[PDB]
C-alpha cells in the first residue's frame, strides 16, 4: 500500500510516534518518504546478505528475521514479512524499540541526511489530526 502523507501521519500519531523520545511527528513522515517513498511493501537488498523491509526499511540482520540473513539478531523478535503489511503497527512497534533515546532516529540514514535540519513539520501541515 502507498500512503498519502496525511494518512500516514494520522496513523503514526495514533500509534504514539508524535513526540516519541522528543521527535516531532514530521520527522517520522519525512523518514518514511525518503526511505520507502511511503510504500509498505518496499524492499531493498544491501551489499551484505541483508534486506530492509517495509515503510521504515527495517534491517533483517539486526531487527527482524527473514530466515536468509547470515547472523540474524532479530532484536524486535518478529518476522520481516510482518513488516510488509498495510497495517504499520508492526513497523511502528519495532521502530519504537530502535529509537531508545533522543538521538535514535539516526538509525535511518535518509533521515539524518535529508530530514534532520529541515522543516519536517512541512510534511504534516494542513493534515487533519
Amino acid at each position: 500500500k502507498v500512503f498519502g502523507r496525511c494518512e500516514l501521519a494520522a496513523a503514526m500519531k495514533r500509534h504514539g510516534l508524535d513526540n516519541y523520545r522528543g521527535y516531532s511527528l514530521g520527522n517520522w513522515v519525512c523518514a518514511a518518504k525518503f526511505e520507502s517513498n511511503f510504500n509498505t511493501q518496499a524492499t531493498n537488498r544491501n551489499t551484505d546478505g541483508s534486506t530492509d523491509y517495509g515503510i521504515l526499511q527495517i534491517n533483517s540482520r539486526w531487527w527482524c528475521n527473514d530466515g536468509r540473513t547470515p547472523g540474524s539478531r532479530n532484536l524486535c523478535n518478529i518476522p520481516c514479512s510482518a513488516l510488509l503489511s498495510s497495517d504499520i503497527t508492526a513497523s511502528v512497534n519495532c521502530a519504537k524499540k530502535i529509537v531508545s533515546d533522543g538521538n535514535g532516529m539516526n538509525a535511518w540514514v535518509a533521515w539524518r541526511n535529508r530530514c534532520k535540519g529541515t522543516d519536517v513539520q512541512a510534511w504534516i501541515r494542513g493534515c487533519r489530526l
Epitope: N19, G22, S24, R112, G117, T118, D119, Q121, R125
Partner: antibody, heavy 116, light 107 residues
C-alpha cells in the same frame, strides 16, 4: 559541548549597515537551524528570522526588507545583516540553536546601540 | 502572523506558592509551543517544549499544559531560583513570535 557566541560592532549610525556574527561549536550547521532574536532594553524577546540546516531562510514579516541571514558551514559561522538602521533597533541580539522546534541553546548575546 | 497574548504581565509570590502563567494564541498552534525562563542579565533558557515536555535538567515542579489556542505553565512550590521572566513562543510555520513576557517577583 554546544556553544554559540555573537560578535558585533556595538555602535552604528543610520548610514552604516549592521553585521553580526554567530560562531558556533559542538554541532554541525547542516543538521540544525539557527534563529536570531533581539531584546530591546527592558522589553521582551522579538523574533528576527532563521536559517535552516538546508540553507533556507525565513524572516520577521515587518523586517524582511531590511534583513539578510547567511552562513558558512565550513567556518561554523552564521551572519545577520541589517540596513536602514533605526533607533528602535537598539537592543541585545542573540543567536540560538533550533533543534526540532525548540531553541535549546542560546548565545550570551551582544549589545547594539543605534545613534544619529 | 500568529500573535501570542501572555498574562499576567507581572506576578508577586513567595517561596512555596504555586503560580500559573498563560499564553493564548490568535490561531491554532497545534501544541508547538515552548517556554523559556530568563534571569536578570542572562540568556533565556528552554524550560518546556511541545507544550508538556520538560527539557533536560529542568525540575519536575514545572509543568505545561494546553491544546488548541490556550496554553499554561504551572510552577508548583516556587523556589528562590525560580524568580525572573518567562516567555512562550510558538513554532507553527513562520514567522515565529513570542509572548509579551511575565515577570515573577518575590513577596
Amino acid at each position: 559541548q554546544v556553544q554559540l557566541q555573537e560578535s558585533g560592532p556595538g555602535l552604528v549610525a543610520p548610514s552604516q549597515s549592521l553585521s553580526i556574527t554567530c560562531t558556533v561549536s559542538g554541532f554541525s550547521l547542516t543538521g540544525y537551524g539557527v534563529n536570531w532574536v533581539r531584546q530591546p532594553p527592558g522589553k521582551g524577546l522579538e523574533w528576527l528570522g532563521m536559517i535552516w540546516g538546508d540553507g533556507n531562510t525565513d524572516y520577521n514579516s515587518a523586517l524582511k526588507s531590511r534583513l539578510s541571514i547567511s552562513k558558512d558551514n565550513s567556518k561554523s559561522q552564521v551572519f545577520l545583516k541589517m540596513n536602514s538602521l533605526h533607533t528602535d533597533d537598539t537592543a541585545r541580539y542573540y543567536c540560538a540553536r533550533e533543534r526540532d522546534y525548540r531553541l535549546d541553546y542560546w548565545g550570551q548575546g551582544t549589545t547594539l546601540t543605534v545613534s544619529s | 502572523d500568529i500573535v501570542l497574548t501572555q498574562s499576567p504581565a507581572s506576578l508577586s509570590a513567595s517561596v512555596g506558592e504555586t503560580v500559573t502563567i498563560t499564553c493564548r494564541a490568535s490561531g491554532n498552534i497545534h501544541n508547538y509551543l515552548a517556554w523559556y525562563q530568563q534571569k536578570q542579565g542572562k540568556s533565556p533558557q528552554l524550560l518546556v517544549y511541545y507544550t508538556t515536555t520538560l527539557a533536560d535538567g529542568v525540575p519536575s515542579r514545572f509543568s505545561g499544559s494546553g491544546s488548541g489556542t490556550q496554553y499554561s505553565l504551572k510552577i508548583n512550590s516556587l523556589q528562590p531560583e525560580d524568580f525572573g521572566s518567562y516567555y512562550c513562543q510558538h513554532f507553527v510555520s513562520t514567522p515565529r513570535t513570542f509572548g509579551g513576557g511575565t515577570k515573577l517577583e518575590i513577596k
